[PDB]
Design a protein around this motif. Structure first.
Motif, PDB file in Angstrom:
ATOM      1  N   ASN A   1       0.858  -1.214   0.000  1.00 53.82           N
ATOM      2  CA  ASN A   1       0.000   0.000   0.000  1.00 53.82           C
ATOM      3  C   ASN A   1       0.884   1.251   0.000  1.00 53.82           C
TER       4      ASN A   1
ATOM      5  N   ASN B   1      -0.629   4.362   0.315  1.00 53.23           N
ATOM      6  CA  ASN B   1      -1.598   5.410   0.731  1.00 53.23           C
ATOM      7  C   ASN B   1      -0.852   6.487   1.525  1.00 53.23           C
ATOM      8  N   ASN B   2       0.089   6.076   2.376  1.00 52.19           N
ATOM      9  CA  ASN B   2       0.848   7.043   3.213  1.00 52.19           C
ATOM     10  C   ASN B   2       1.687   7.986   2.339  1.00 52.19           C
TER      11      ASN B   2
ATOM     12  N   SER C   1      -0.510   8.666  -2.045  1.00 46.34           N
ATOM     13  CA  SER C   1      -1.729   9.485  -1.812  1.00 46.34           C
ATOM     14  C   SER C   1      -1.363  10.691  -0.942  1.00 46.34           C
ATOM     15  N   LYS C   2      -1.931  11.863  -1.235  1.00 46.51           N
ATOM     16  CA  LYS C   2      -1.548  13.093  -0.491  1.00 46.51           C
ATOM     17  C   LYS C   2      -2.701  14.100  -0.529  1.00 46.51           C
TER      18      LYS C   2
ATOM     19  N   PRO D   1      -5.836  10.616   0.156  1.00 45.50           N
ATOM     20  CA  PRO D   1      -5.005  10.305   1.327  1.00 45.50           C
ATOM     21  C   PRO D   1      -5.677   9.318   2.293  1.00 45.50           C
ATOM     22  N   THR D   2      -7.000   9.416   2.454  1.00 48.55           N
ATOM     23  CA  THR D   2      -7.748   8.540   3.400  1.00 48.55           C
ATOM     24  C   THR D   2      -8.455   7.429   2.616  1.00 48.55           C
TER      25      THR D   2
ATOM     26  N   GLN E   1      -6.892   1.939  -2.085  1.00 45.11           N
ATOM     27  CA  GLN E   1      -5.552   2.491  -1.742  1.00 45.11           C
ATOM     28  C   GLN E   1      -4.619   2.336  -2.941  1.00 45.11           C
TER      29      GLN E   1
ATOM     30  N   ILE F   1      -8.887  10.258   9.003  1.00 48.53           N
ATOM     31  CA  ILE F   1      -7.946   9.131   9.274  1.00 48.53           C
ATOM     32  C   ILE F   1      -7.875   8.218   8.047  1.00 48.53           C
ATOM     33  N   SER F   2      -6.663   7.896   7.583  1.00 50.48           N
ATOM     34  CA  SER F   2      -6.505   6.949   6.447  1.00 50.48           C
ATOM     35  C   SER F   2      -6.919   5.543   6.891  1.00 50.48           C
ATOM     36  N   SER F   3      -7.469   4.742   5.978  1.00 56.63           N
ATOM     37  CA  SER F   3      -7.979   3.401   6.368  1.00 56.63           C
ATOM     38  C   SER F   3      -6.843   2.509   6.887  1.00 56.63           C
TER      39      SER F   3
ATOM     40  N   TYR G   1      -4.158   8.797  10.049  1.00 51.65           N
ATOM     41  CA  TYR G   1      -3.552   9.950   9.331  1.00 51.65           C
ATOM     42  C   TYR G   1      -3.076  10.991  10.349  1.00 51.65           C
TER      43      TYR G   1
END
Lengths: 147, 66, 119, 110, 120, 148, 105
Positions: free
Chosen positions: A42, A44-45, A48-49, A104-105, A111, C50-52, C56
């Motif tokens: 993933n 996502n951190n 994704s932004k 981001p979320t 993701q 919050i990211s899944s 976050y």
């Protein structure tokens, strides 16, 4: 071989040997007889932004299905309509590449996932690359296992 | 038509005759046999002892230049 | 499909309190959860999202609420901790459920819960 | 980054509602698939409406409509029902904290 | 006034496209008529194209594969010629038309020859 | 050499061996698709004695009925026969799963109002055509029969 | 809808010289006529076979009965004659006749 590319978590399933997907059909193709491991983690951190940069892109429309391990970088507008695109966006003309949208979320299914494809020639090829396999003194004139 | 190659020993000769099973010569040195169309062989009225068995009472030999 | 909460609470200003939001009808990992506070007779304020995959822990630009949001997947409960509690901080708090990525990414609601920061 | 909403508007059934969502800074985003709408009824926590019709269109009466451009997103309604008014919120997206509308309450007379 | 491309020549079995921009009038207001005249021969109406909405109406006496594409914003009428033949070796004229069934044609393009040769 | 390859030995013994199979290869490939349009009297609809008024046009669906414009090209009796999307022969050959036919009487000037994305008195209240239309519109002068 | 008006012309100028549109058995009240010059994009002369468009000297009139039409060029000189094509608009393929290559002494 290390192949670096961007795909959604659901899309990663589409890119498999013997697996048919929209992602597999146009932007990237994985060989059915291909030998190797595909690793997805993933992103996502990092990928994704809040900015949600659209630098990542995928091919929404391709004139023909992608051949296995072949790359298409053409940006020419797809002529779905009878009227010619003329190299510009037009009615009945759709851009081949659609910019990737990421959040981001985003949920684990949505993701962004970084995917690396590894291919190995293995047997019948001089061993340029080797496993750590600490080497053991060769033994001759005796029946012994050899690697 | 199955392709059957009538070949004498390679040292003796490199010449070859092609037989197509159950087909006329038109589908493909002209002869017609019950086994099929025969090419690379010239029909001879004289009868000789069989050397290679083409089949259907027809045989092939290397004879005169041969 | 159903979002549960804690009820209202009373804390002296200056302390802290932990707040809960049970999530049911969906996997906690699949959909992200966020806390939104609306002051009475005032517009809502979005503290963080919050990211899944992992918290976050976003912090707002300029003035910062300083509230900390944590998610436990096994519990399926959204957790909010508020520090330096103030009368200005007091607002109705709603936990909300995210959907698949698109324009806004959020559909379901917790009904909301009061905040009492008082002596 | 910072958003404002019309101070007040009050309406009547049959009327076609458009509220001014006033967006400072940039107009929308490079994606052009951003912005959201919300409705807070008393005793009823708010609810999604339409986020540029990106997804989940079903579930909302098609009488609900609108679009957006520039620094003002265009609200649209038709044949409003006297029980269906509530403050509409146009939360921002993709740039900085989202933030929310100032709030306009419809006040039918009669 | 109408303006076509210059005179052109091409080999058989190729695909070619000619043009005709419109000036002094709205493209949508007046229809475009494509007429082909063989040298020292009677005028032949290959096809008529509707400007506002793309139209593909062609004469069935002969087929020249004359695809017609019209875009209102461009203000240009496009005629595509494929499978070039001896009949296709003729002057091609765009033409101003009524937007009605009378179809009178009086304003034209310069007329463009599309020569067909073994080697272009 | 085929005999040597089948034997797997360069030397070939005297005799007859079947080393290959010969099949006639097709000169060309012919492709016919499963018929989908169906059949009907297409000529009768054109030959109908009376046509409905434009304000309340009759609608007849051309489904389970033949699609044949070859006769229409031969007749050449239509004042306007515009076609859209593809060349007239190409649409004629293609089978159409569902077609819709609308029958009405209008003046020759009035026919323009019945066109894709066209605004007119006959286009705003009599009937309307969508801006993107792949259908072909057929209009013929009926002064000899309709006028009295 | 085939037309066969007039192969060509050979006559002293300045005369009332007629070119005779030979129409097909199908009749069409509407028509047109265009003047062609050598390697010059022609231009329609006679609109609807009876009305004049702006910019035509009245040297050539168009008078016809039913399907038949005649473009009587009255008092034509050695300055005007070229080819003159007929046009038919009623039948779907708007065919053009052989046309008259006007020539004169």
């Amino acid at each position: 071989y290390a192949d670096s590319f961007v795909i959604r978590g659901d899309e990663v399933r589409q890119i498999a040997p013997g697996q048919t997907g929209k992602i597999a059909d146009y932007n990237y193709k994985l060989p059915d007889d291909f030998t190797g491991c595909v690793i997805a983690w993933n992103s996502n951190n990092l990928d994704s932004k809040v900015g949600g940069n659209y630098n990542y892109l995928y091919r929404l429309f391709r004139k023909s299905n992608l051949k296995p391990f072949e790359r298409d970088i053409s940006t020419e507008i797809y002529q779905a309509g009878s009227t010619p695109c003329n190299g510009v966006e037009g009615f009945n003309c759709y851009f081949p590449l659609q910019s990737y949208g990421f959040q981001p979320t985003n949920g684990v299914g949505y993701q962004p996932y970084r995917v690396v494809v590894l291919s190995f020639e293995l047997l019948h090829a001089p061993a340029t690359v080797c496993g750590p396999k600490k080497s053991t003194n060769l033994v001759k004139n005796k029946c012994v296992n050899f690697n | 038509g199955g392709v059957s190659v009538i070949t004498p020993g390679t040292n003796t000769s490199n010449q070859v005759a092609v037989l197509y099973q159950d087909v006329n010569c038109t589908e493909v040195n002209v002869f017609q046999t019950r086994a099929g169309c025969l090419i690379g062989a010239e029909h001879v009225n004289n009868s000789y002892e069989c050397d290679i068995p083409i089949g259907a009472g027809i045989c092939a030999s290397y004879q005169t230049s041969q | 499909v159903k979002l549960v909460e804690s009820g209202g609470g009373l804390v002296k200003p200056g302390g802290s309190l932990r707040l809960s939001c049970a999530a049911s009808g969906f996997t906690f990992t699949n959909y992200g959860m966020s806390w939104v506070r609306q002051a009475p007779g005032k517009r809502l304020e979005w503290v963080a999202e919050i990211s899944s995959g992992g918290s976050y822990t976003y912090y707002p630009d300029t003035v910062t609420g300083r509230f900390t949001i944590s998610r436990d997947n096994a519990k399926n409960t959204l957790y909010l901790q508020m520090n330096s509690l103030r009368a200005e901080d007091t607002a109705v708090y709603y936990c909300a459920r995210f959907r698949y990525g698109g324009g806004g990414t959020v559909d379901y609601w917790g009904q909301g819960t009061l905040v009492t920061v008082s002596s | 980054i910072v958003l404002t909403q019309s101070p007040t508007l009050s309406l009547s059934p049959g009327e076609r509602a458009t509220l001014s969502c006033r967006a400072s800074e940039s107009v929308d985003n490079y994606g052009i698939s951003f912005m959201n709408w919300f409705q807070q009824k008393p005793g009823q926590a708010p609810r999604l409406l339409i986020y540029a019709a990106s997804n989940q269109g079903s579930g909302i009466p098609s009488r609900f409509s609108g679009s957006g451009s520039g620094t003002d997103f265009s609200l649209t309604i038709s044949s409003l029902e006297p029980e269906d008014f509530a403050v509409y919120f146009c939360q921002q997206s993709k740039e900085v904290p989202r933030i929310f509308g100032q709030g306009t309450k419809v006040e039918i007379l009669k | 006034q109408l303006v076509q491309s210059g005179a052109e020549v091409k080999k058989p079995g190729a695909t070619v496209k000619i043009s005709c921009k419109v000036s002094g009038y709205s493209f949508s207001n007046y229809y475009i008529h494509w007429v082909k005249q063989a040298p020292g021969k009677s005028l032949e109406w290959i096809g008529y194209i509707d400007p506002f909405n793309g139209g593909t109406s062609d004469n069935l006496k002969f087929k020249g594969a004359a695809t017609l594409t019209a875009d209102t914003s461009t203000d240009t009428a496009y005629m595509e010629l494929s499978s070039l033949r001896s009949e296709d070796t003729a002057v091609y004229y765009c033409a101003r038309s009524e937007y009605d069934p009378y179809y009178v044609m009086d304003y034209w393009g310069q007329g463009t020859t599309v020569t067909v040769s073994s080697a272009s | 050499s085929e005999t040597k390859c089948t034997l797997k030995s360069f030397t070939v013994e005297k005799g007859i061996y079947q080393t290959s199979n010969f099949r006639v290869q097709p000169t060309e490939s012919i492709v016919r698709f499963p018929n989908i349009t169906n059949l009907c009297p297409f000529g009768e609809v054109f030959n109908a004695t009376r046509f409905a008024s434009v304000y309340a046009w009759n609608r007849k669906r051309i489904s389970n009925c033949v699609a044949d414009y070859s006769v229409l090209y031969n007749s050449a009796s239509f004042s306007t026969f515009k076609c859209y999307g593809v060349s007239p022969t190409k649409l004629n050959d293609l089978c159409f799963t569902n077609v819709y036919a609308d029958s009405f009487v209008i003046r020759g000037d009035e026919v323009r109002q019945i066109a894709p994305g066209q605004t007119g008195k006959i286009a705003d209240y009599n009937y309307k055509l969508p801006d993107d239309f792949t259908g072909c519109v057929i209009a013929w002068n009926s002064n000899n029969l309709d006028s009295k | 809808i085939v037309l066969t008006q007039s192969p060509f012309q050979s006559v002293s100028p300045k005369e009332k010289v007629t070119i005779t549109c030979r129409a097909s058995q199908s009749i069409s009240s509407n028509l047109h006529w265009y003047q062609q010059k050598p390697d010059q994009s022609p231009k329609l002369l006679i609109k609807y076979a009876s009305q004049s468009i702006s910019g035509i000297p009245s040297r050539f009139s168009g008078s016809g009965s039913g399907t038949d039409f005649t473009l009587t060029i009255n008092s034509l000189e050695a300055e005007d004659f070229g080819i003159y094509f007929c046009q038919q608009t009623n039948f779907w393929p708007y065919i053009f006749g052989q046309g008259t290559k006007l020539e004169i002494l």
